[PDB]
Amino acid sequence: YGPLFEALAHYNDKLLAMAKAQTERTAQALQQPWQLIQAQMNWWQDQLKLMQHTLQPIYDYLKQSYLLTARHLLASVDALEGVPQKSRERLRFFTRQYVNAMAPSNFLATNPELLKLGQNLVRGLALLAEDLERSADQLNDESAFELGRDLALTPGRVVQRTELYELIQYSPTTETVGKTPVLIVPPFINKYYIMDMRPQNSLVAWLVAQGQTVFMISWRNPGVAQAQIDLDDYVVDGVIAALDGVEAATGEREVHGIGYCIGGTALSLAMGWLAARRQKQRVRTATLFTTLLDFSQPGELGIFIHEPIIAALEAQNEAKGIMDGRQLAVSFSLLRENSLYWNYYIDSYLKGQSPVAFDLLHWNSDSTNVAGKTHNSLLRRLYLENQLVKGELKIRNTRIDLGKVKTPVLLVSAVDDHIALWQGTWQGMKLFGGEQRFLLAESGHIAGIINPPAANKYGFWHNGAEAESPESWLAGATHQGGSWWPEMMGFIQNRDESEPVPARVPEEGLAPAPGHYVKVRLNPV
């Protein structure tokens, strides 16, 4: 009631400064036009002023509000006349993507009718699923983005290709690198290049610039041929087999592990599997981004965790062979940042960059399938039964006890995370039997994790002392502005300290940097 007016004025001043800057650059000579953003900023201010004026009358506001959207339509299209049609079509496609992404009814997890809704609930769930998927198909233009050119362009080589993954080894870009390599295990629900989007916000590029040999697992988009691949296979044949692949290319049997969402869960299970069978420690440090080990707080995804629903999904998976990612794309959204338009479209434009919200929407729509047996194990053994905390989880007939893991773990979570609640991630940290550290990012599931140091856009909470509850941890935590990536880099290099080793140049391998598994789309472009 007031701060909105002041904050809106601040954004208008930055656009006016950018408008003057664009005129000065045009003077030296003698993308979206600033008039298009001005058309939107004019709507936000006038609507707030009209609302303040109001603070038959309902109709008067409706008529006056309808006049403001009409002014918004006329000013926007007028700005798009000098823009070429191909670039303009890109803007129309992404705006259609963004406008449907912000509708809670468009996703089952946030759908009102599903919340309103035994067998009758299961039958109605299928009705909501088929309608949303049909709407997505008709909406889903082409030539949006090409991997290796616009996204996932960090130089490297594919040093190994298995049934489940392609192992990417990135170019060093430094004269010296650390002895212990870095292995990143991305989630197999979406594609990995969220950590390798663009050079300014690519986590892979930043880790490489810090003198570290970075390896990235690139999971295959599973087809019907991978119907029997289970969670056990992704742990043993996925993560551990990648560890053997890193040793085969660098000669180091010990690496720094990094995991994201369910990828960190697989990394945790791999460390528990090696520990339970008394194998020499192959993971020196383990950084886990928004990883869920205790599934007691599933968040909005708990609407699906019910015996009739899970039993129905298990039958569907076994019938179709795999879980169709296009069905998962309407089930929930991994990208739900608060004020995506303000912080990643308006702010990203005023920084001279191509709108980051465009890249985020393309990654969110680059859905991937899940193996039939894997999804079921993930639904039942982890989300429903919560075997990992109860010590009942078995990976290839090996009971997993994370207390047997002595690898120092660093859990980096996000306060506004809607997929992996930070409190839930905090409880799973105590499961480990070694050093434990916790970090709490300021933004959401995606924005709070991909915050490069240069952006200086958010912050984090750190606390070295132990607490008995997440609320107690945060109460004693100290806030630090900026990115937490240097803190993670300090967490890795303060425990290996090892003499620097000459930069490992990747071998030619089988394929160029991005690989082939990441380019396989469910809806081909």
User: What angle (nearest 5°) sits at the alpha carbon of residue 361, between those of residues 205 and 108?
Assistant: 125
CA distances from 299 to 211, 296, 419 (A): 38, 9, 6
Mind telling me the catalytic residues? 261
Q: According to the binding rule CB under 8 A, does residue 163 interact with a copy of itself?
A: yes
Are 201 and 274 a contacting pair, CB within 8 Å?
no
Is 223 a binding residue for a copy of itself by CB under 8 A? The answer is: yes
Binding letters toward a copy of itself, positions 396-425, x by CB under 8 A: -x----------------------------
Residues listed for the chain = 525
How many angstroms separate the Cα of 289 from the Cα of each of 103, 176, 349, 360, 394?
27, 27, 28, 18, 23
Q: What's the gap between Cα 407 and its chain centre?
A: 25
Binding part of the chain for a copy of itself, among 206-214, 246-254, 272-280, 351-359 by CB under 8 A, reads 272-280
Q: Minimal distance in Å, beta carbon 245 to a copy of itself? A: 14
User: Can you tell me the distance from the alpha carbon of 268 to that of 287, in angstroms, rounded to the nearest whole number?
Assistant: 10
CA pair distance 202, 359, nearest whole angstrom: 12
Q: Is 391 in the site for a copy of itself (CB under 8 A)?
A: no
Encoding tokens for residue 503?
């930069």
Please identify which residue in 21, 67, 248, 315 interacts with a copy of itself, judged by CB under 8 A: 67
Q: In the complex with a copy of itself, which residue's Cβ is closer, 134 or 466?
A: 134
113 or 163: CB nearest a copy of itself: 163
Find the binder of a copy of itself among 14, 430, 516, 519 (CB under 8 A). Answer: 516
What's the Rg (C-alpha) of the chain?
24
User: In angstroms, what is the minimal distance from the CB of 244 to a copy of itself?
Assistant: 13
- Partners of residue 183 on adjacent β-strands: 215, 257
Q: Which helix (H) or strand (E) holds 13?
A: helix 3-29
Asked whether position 228 contacts a copy of itself by CB under 8 A, the answer is: no
One of 30, 84, 138, 499 touching a copy of itself (CB under 8 A): 30
- According to CB under 8 A, which one of 18, 42, 71, 297 is a site residue for a copy of itself? 71
Q: How far apart are CA 96 and CA 440, in angstroms?
A: 33
Q: Which stretch binds a copy of itself (CB under 8 A): 63-71, 124-132, 447-455, 461-469?
A: 63-71
- Considering the rule CB under 8 A, would residue 4 count as an interface residue with a copy of itself? yes
| Inter-residue contact 229 to 373 (CB < 8 Å) | yes
Closer residue to a copy of itself in complex, CB, 105/472: 105
Handedness of CA 312, 314, 319, 325 (dihedral sign): positive
Total residues at the site for a copy of itself (CB under 8 A)? 55
Near a copy of itself in 327-386, by CB under 8 A: 341, 369
Q: What are the structure tokens assigned to 48, written together?
A: 């707030």
CA distance 337 to 348: 14
CA dist 416 to 108, 193, 306, 421, 445, Å? 20, 22, 25, 8, 7
Does residue 146 belong to the site contacting a copy of itself (CB under 8 A)? Answer: no
Rounded to whole angstroms, the Cα distance separating 170 from 375 reads 30
Choosing from 51, 115, 127, 505, the residue that interacts with a copy of itself (CB under 8 A) is: 51
Check residue 127 for interaction with a copy of itself (CB under 8 A): no
Q: Angle at Cα 147 formed by Cα 146 and Cα 148, nearest 5°?
A: 110
Q: What's the closest the beta carbon of residue 416 comes to a copy of itself, in angstroms?
A: 13
Note whether 43 binds a copy of itself by CB under 8 A: yes
Min dist. Cβ of residue 124 to a copy of itself (A) = 22
319 binds a copy of itself (CB under 8 A): no
Interacting residues with a copy of itself (CB under 8 A): 1, 3-4, 27, 30, 43-44, 47-48, 51, 56, 58-59, 61-63, 65-74, 76-77, 92, 95-96, 98-99, 102-103, 142, 161-163, 221-225, 276-278, 341, 369, 397, 516, 520, 522-524
